[PDB]
Design a binder for this molecule. Structure first.
Ligand SMILES: C[n+]1cn([C@@H]2O[C@H](COP(=O)(O)OP(=O)(O)OP(=O)(O)O)[C@@H](O)[C@H]2O)c2nc(N)[nH]c(=O)c21
Lengths: 35, 176
């Protein structure tokens, strides 16, 4: 089974806590990676 | 939260940034930002980076499947092409970020069904002459796949009649 998601499903996750944890290991790119 | 289960994507994706510096060879200006393979890790990245509409003219974002370089020369791109839309100056503030996000959702959500395997990635070019957004596919002569991706993409973007969409092979782009 392929993992397919519609837009409403995806948008529902934008602001859950797991989606607000800053990713680890990001490069320092000024005004691109918001620190 | 310590037991939360993320929602897996079909593919692992890499987000790239391009900085305009004409003193350097083109690929030297590419920067990998990060890779992800869940819905929540997509949003965690998106939520911590600048909007396309706020990038300096001459810069790009690209989202490509892991292992595909965001350039024509990659084995998975060299025989391929792009479905391209071009915006005008007014549309940067009103539509660029919305169209780019919708493009990202089409990619990570595998919205092209049995043709999503022909998708390589997508690119947003922030340009003074007109911003561009495109989905890159792997084979310009996979015409069933190219048709399906183009038709669904245009529907998902909800383009007005004034913003048209067309496909071009990378071979033709490179030769202008
Ligand atoms: C996507 N891409 C862009 N370039 C270089 O970047 C230049 C500009 O390519 P561009 O995609 O940034 O478009 P721009 O709007 O700036 O200008 P246009 O040419 O009028 O459409 C190309 O002419 C190439 O020199 C590329 N050069 C290589 N080697 N490979 C690529 O994949 C590639």
């Amino acid at each position: 089974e392929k993992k397919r998601y519609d837009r409403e499903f995806l948008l529902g996750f934008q602001f859950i806590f797991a989606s607000m944890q800053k990713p680890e290991g990001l490069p320092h790119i000024s005004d691109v990676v918001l620190d | 939260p310590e037991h939360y289960i993320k929602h897996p994507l079909q593919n692992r994706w890499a987000l790239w940034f391009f900085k305009n510096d004409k003193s350097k060879t083109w690929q030297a200006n590419l920067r990998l930002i990060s890779k992800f393979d869940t819905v929540e890790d997509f949003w965690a990245l998106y939520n911590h980076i600048q909007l396309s509409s706020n990038l300096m003219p001459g810069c790009d974002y690209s989202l490509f499947k892991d292992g595909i370089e965001p350039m024509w020369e990659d084995e998975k791109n060299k025989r391929g092409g792009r479905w391209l839309i071009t915006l005008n100056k007014q549309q940067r503030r009103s539509d660029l970020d919305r169209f780019w996000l919708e493009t990202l959702l089409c990619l990570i959500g595998e919205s092209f069904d049995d043709y999503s395997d022909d998708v390589c990635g997508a690119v947003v070019n922030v340009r003074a002459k007109g911003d561009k957004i495109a989905i890159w596919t792997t084979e310009c002569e996979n015409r069933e796949a190219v048709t399906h991706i183009g038709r669904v993409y245009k529907e998902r973007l909800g383009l007005p009649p004034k913003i048209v969409i067309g496909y071009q092979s990378h071979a033709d782009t490179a030769t202008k």
